[PDB]
Amino acid sequence: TTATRLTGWGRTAPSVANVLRTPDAEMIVKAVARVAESGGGRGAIARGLGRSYGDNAQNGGGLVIDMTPLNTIHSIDADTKLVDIDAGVNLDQLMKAALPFGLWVPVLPGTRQVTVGGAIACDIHGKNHHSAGSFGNHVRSMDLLTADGEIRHLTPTGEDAELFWATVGGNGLTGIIMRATIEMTPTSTAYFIADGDVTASLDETIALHSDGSEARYTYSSAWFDAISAPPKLGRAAVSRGRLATVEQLPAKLRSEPLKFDAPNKYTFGPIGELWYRKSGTYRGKVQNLTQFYHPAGFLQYQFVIPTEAVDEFKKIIGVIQASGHYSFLNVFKLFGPRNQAPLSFPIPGWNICVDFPIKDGLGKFVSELDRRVLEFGGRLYTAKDSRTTAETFHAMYPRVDEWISVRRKVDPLRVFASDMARRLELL
Numbered sequence: 002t003t004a005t006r007l008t009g010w011g012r013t014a015p016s017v018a019n020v021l022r023t024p025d026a027e028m029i030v031k032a033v034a035r036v037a038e039s040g041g042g043r044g045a046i047a048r049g050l051g052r053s054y055g056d057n058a059q060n061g062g063g064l065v066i067d068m069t070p071l072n073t074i075h076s077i078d079a080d081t082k083l084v085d086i087d088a089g090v091n092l093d094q095l096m097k098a099a100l101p102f103g104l105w106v107p108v109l110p111g112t113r114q115v116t117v118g119g120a121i122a123c124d125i126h127g128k129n130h131h132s133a134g135s136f137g138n139h140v141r142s143m144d145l146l147t148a149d150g151e152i153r154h155l156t157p158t159g160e161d162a163e164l165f166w167a168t169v170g171g172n173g174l175t176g177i178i179m180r181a182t183i184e185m186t187p188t189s190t191a192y193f194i195a196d197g198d199v200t201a202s203l204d205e206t207i208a209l210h211s212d213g214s215e216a217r218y219t220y221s222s223a224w225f226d227a228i229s230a231p232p233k234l235g236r237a238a239v240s241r242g243r244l245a246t247v248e249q250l251p252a253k254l255r256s257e258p259l260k261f262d263a264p265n266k267y268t269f270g271p272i273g274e275l276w277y278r279k280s281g282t283y284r285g286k287v288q289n290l291t292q293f294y295h296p297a298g299f300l301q302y303q304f305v306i307p308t309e310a311v312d313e314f315k316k317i318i319g320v321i322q323a324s325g326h327y328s329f330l331n332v333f334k335l336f337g338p339r340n341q342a343p344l345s346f347p348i349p350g351w352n353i354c355v356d357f358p359i360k361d362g363l364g365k366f367v368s369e370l371d372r373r374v375l376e377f378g379g380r381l382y383t384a385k386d387s388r389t390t391a392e393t394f395h396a397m398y399p400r401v402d403e404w405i406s407v408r409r410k411v412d413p414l415r416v417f418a419s420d421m422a423r424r425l426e427l428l
């Protein structure tokens with residue numbers, strides 16, 4: 002163990018905790034079982050690759066278990082479509098291993114550098130949520146080290162389904178995931194057929210997302226403008242598509258379908274708008290995973306607003322543009338059907354990712370966004386959150402009492418605690 006000053010991805014809210022780095026799973030149990038012997042506050046929390054901007058992976062004055070050295074891939078089956086990996090396997094290595102099997106990772110996020118454990122405990126969502134769902138929708142099994150010292154096999158529709166769905170999106174507060182079984186998406190190739198569209202306004206962006214085009218694509222997301230004033234506010238470059246098949250690939254890349262090949266004055270004028278429009282408009286473009294998907298002093302803010310709340314979603318975008326806080330990196334998506342995890346972030350609706358530069362009055366401004374998001378029936382993402390209040394969060398997640406009841410039953414001693422847990426009063 003080493004006392005380290007660790008952080009979320011946001012470089013924010015430093016906390017000092019004793020970190021454990023061991024590949025011995027049995028060793029991991031000893032420390033957890035030792036903490037219950039200490040029978041006191043400052044519990045233990047698991048940690049993946051620290052890609053969450055929040056304080057969900059730190060436990061100040063407590064214990065942190067870095068799960069990254071448990072990166073053994075046990076089995077991959079192309080017939081069953083099942084992989085079996087330890088919770089410290091990252092999604093980049095898992096993808097690499099599975100492509101030769103004709104398999105694809107069911108849910109991939111913006112970054113590839115996330116653990117299986119991290120992917121489950123934040124129930125990560127991706128460019129394909131509307132066609133595939135969250136990461137938890139694909140976990141066919143997982144083994145969880147609970148507070149009692151026991152390791153419990155968990156299943157989605159099994160007898161222990163309650164504790165399963167509480168661990169899905171449960172920010173590691175149910176226990177430490179050790180090993181999981183994930184059903185993969187079958188794939189003919191490692192390429193994408195891509196379809197591109199450019200919009201001129203927020204209305205035209207929303208129109209395209211509710212006209213029915215979404216049905217044609219399994220993957221969908223868009224870069225959007227949040228600086229320009231109406232009507233240009235909300236204009237977007239949309240990138241949509243699906244996993245390609247061999248026959249769809251050009252013959253020169255038919256060789257190895259499952260290969261992962263390694264990587265003015267007009268601009269603002271009417272011709273610039275026209276040039277950008279045609280260059281952003283394309284049909285059936287064959288692309289790499291890099292080309293399609295993965296092309297400190299900031300604060301990333303992510304919220305979703307229920308689908309039917311179209312106008313109140315348009316209102317909050319107008320607010321952000323009006324506030325004088327300028328965000329350039331903006332991701333727009335329309336989530337499909339939510340799952341049955343109480344603490345799951347995604348619900349069907351209008352997902353926004355904004356990235357604000359830290360400056361005077363931002364903390365207070367985003368507290369006013371928290372207010373509107375909550376008011377318009379939406380929620381925030383624990384993975385992105387470092388500074389919302391417990392009260393605001395509890396109201397955003399109506400099933401929070403349902404989740405806490407599970408966590409109280411499985412971990413009454415409060416063996417598993419984190420900075421977030423205390424902040425959002427989930428213990």
Ligand SMILES: Cc1cc2nc3c(=O)[nH]c(=O)nc-3n(C[C@H](O)[C@H](O)[C@H](O)COP(=O)(O)OP(=O)(O)OC[C@H]3O[C@@H](n4cnc5c(N)ncnc54)[C@H](O)[C@@H]3O)c2cc1C
Binds near residue numbers: 049126176
């Ligand atoms: C550039 C970038 C882009 C991103 N894009 C997306 C995106 O498109 N969609 C999206 O949903 N998210 C996105 N994220 C956030 C990230 O995908 C999630 O926060 C992810 O869960 C973090 O994985 P991690 O391995 O870093 O885990 P950490 O950040 O280290 O931990 C995350 C949480 O999971 C718990 N946990 C981790 N491992 C285990 C385990 N073995 N057992 C029990 N609990 C565990 C921890 O306790 C902690 O609460 C992005 C992050 C970055 C930096």
Ligand SMILES: *N(O)c1cc(C(F)(F)F)cc2c1sc(C(=O)NCc1cccnc1)[n+]2[O-]
Binds near residue numbers: 112127222303334
């Ligand atoms: N929001 O956090 C978010 C949401 C989504 C999706 F809509 F697909 F769910 C995708 C997404 C983000 S943030 C993100 C990202 O990493 N963006 C910025 C970036 C900066 C530097 C280099 N590459 C990307 N992605 O993809």
